[model samples]
Target chain A: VDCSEYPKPACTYEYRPLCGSDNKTYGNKCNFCNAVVESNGTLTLSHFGKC
Target chain B: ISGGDAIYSSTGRCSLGFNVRSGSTYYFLTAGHCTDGATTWWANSARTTVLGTTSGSSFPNNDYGIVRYTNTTIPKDGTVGGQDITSAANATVGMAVTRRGSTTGTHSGSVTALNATVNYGGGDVVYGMIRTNVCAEPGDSGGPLYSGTRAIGLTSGGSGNCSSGGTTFFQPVTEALSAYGVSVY
Candidate 1:
């Protein structure tokens, strides 16, 4: 499936930051998980904060 | 067809900055981190289609990239997610703006500082960046930052995400244009 075809989750606008496995920064757990889902599990929480 | 669109390479997906033309040649702008050490681009991860070739990539200090539209099979024009990009402009502090990329699509914010410097660690430092409260994702690099039809900057890197929002940096489009002598259509 196209990545854009995936639906975005109802992520709250929170400041809890984390880094994705892709080495990109995400807003929070929900935001990171949404991308993880979008990437079909390819993306993961790399570490924390800006990456 | 133009800025704010997606461009793909082996490293991963990055966004296109703007479509430009120089005399009879065609080109597009993106992030240096996306195009660095990579050549050839496609619209899909399958790499079945050809989009362009890397001609220039200036990173670290001034993260912007240039690609020549070598493929003629696909039509090229200056539209980002259906909006026209007629010209380029410098981003002013407090100027209202919107950024677009393949990942996040579109997000709005205001320019917080001009020529701001940022250090991404590991020796990845840049000067003369446009800093804003706009949020961007991993795949949103090289995306276009603009206001209305005027092109402003190209997505560099940033902290945080669209959900919580954070400071995002941009490489001013005018500098990139001047460096390459390319004009937005």
Candidate 2:
């Protein structure tokens, strides 16, 4: 990930788990979105569970 | 004294790193991102047992946090996954090590490098990290990085999964301890 272009967004603290297109797990949808936005829209949801 | 154990905050869960102290006061180290925006941590998911209060947190530039153990009833020894951490040490490249987190339980790997900087995509970049081949996940943040009884680092972040394996990073315990003015027992 590019550090210069990264921007953190607000996300809820909910524990709903999901996997991202990069095959890594996120804490929730908002957390996944946070990752997605930081990835410049490259990362997407892959699944919903431990990865 | 529950290193590598589950710790919960209003922001969700992260793993505890180690038990450290200055004077008579006891505190545990964890990931700063885990304690960020949250205080009053707990040990269980249901939030029944109160663990401690987040005393200090450092992220972005580094990834580490300190939580003061307010509950005197809880055990505060230096145990991480059956291994007793007696002191803090710096991790070197090619050194055999192990990591323990709330999500993955425990996994062993080798120190691939040091002073690794990771831009965790969200402006969450950390510097001077100990990089390893150990696999960790979401809830695994703030876990312990150790070699036998020597405390090494605190879990930060990385890519890949346990199945395929990937690089992981950790905040050196020495830096965190010095920053917080505490030492592992």
Candidate 3:
């Protein structure tokens, strides 16, 4: 199934922080990956932790 | 006070999951890895008090086990320490939860993901785990992961620790309860 159409996660846990290839700082890996799943391969993790 | 308490066997140390029962018999749930090494359990490290016998265990594909309480001295209660478990529930991302372990005491965090699969090397792959940011240590396996009064998961395994922070996985308690045809007390 296409991941982009999937619902987004409500950041509720520890701030793991993830920097995406798009140069955006996600709250955590879950939020970053969820956005990618919602984006369908368009987004990638540039590095661990915040941007 | 109770759920995160320490449990021991001849093989090693681990944490108690939750107290459960089937019919009139009493038992406790813990990680299969904890039970995998030994069949007998003790309440203390000295092994004076006999906790129970490992009646059943499942690992690899799953990470849960049942230990029958042979001794009648230990009080059988629904509350783990102070947390009362009313029912087993599915974990949702963003839900705040707490876990107690002998190594780390009580650490709190939120469910980060679901249906997580972890490979602990040596071909050991556990599936359908609740991934969380809960900090855990070496002796924390088989502990309880709960949200308020709702039972959530059993401590499985993970990397890092409360000092450096780490991601821990848990075997959903509902699956274990269902598999054993038992209920959390």
Measured by DockQ, the strongest candidate is: 2
What is the Cα-based lDDT of residue A26 in candidate 2? 77
Clash count for candidate 3 is: 7
Q: Model 2 over residues A1-51: C-alpha lDDT tens digits? A: 222343432221224477777887777555576677768878877777657
TM-scores of the candidates are 0.79, 0.83, 0.77
Per-residue lDDT over B1-185 for candidate 1, one digit per residue giving the tens place of the 0 to 100 score: 66777788865678888888899999999988778877998887688889989999998788888999878878787877788988888899989999998778899999999988876644667889999999887667888999999999989877667777777889899999999998988
Residue pairs with colliding backbones in model 2 are: B1-B76, B1-B77
Winning candidate number (TM-score): 2
Each candidate's chain A: what TM-score? 0.73, 0.70, 0.69
Q: Candidate 1: DockQ?
A: 0.06
- Candidate 1, residues A1-51: lDDT per residue as tens digits? 223423332322223457777777775454566677768778766677768
Q: Assess each prediction's global lDDT (C-alpha) against the native.
A: 0.80, 0.81, 0.79
lDDT of 2 at B112: 93
Query: Where does candidate 3 stray beyond 4 Å?
Result: A1-51
lDDT of 3 by residue, B45-164 (tens): 789999889999998789998899998878766866788988889999999999988767899999999998887644677889899998776677888999999999999877555877
Which segments of candidate 2 are over 4 A away from where they belong? A1-16, A19-51
| Least accurate 10 contiguous residues by lDDT in model 2 chain A | A5-14
Give the lDDT of residue A50 in candidate 3. Answer: 59
**What DockQ does model 2 achieve?**
0.17
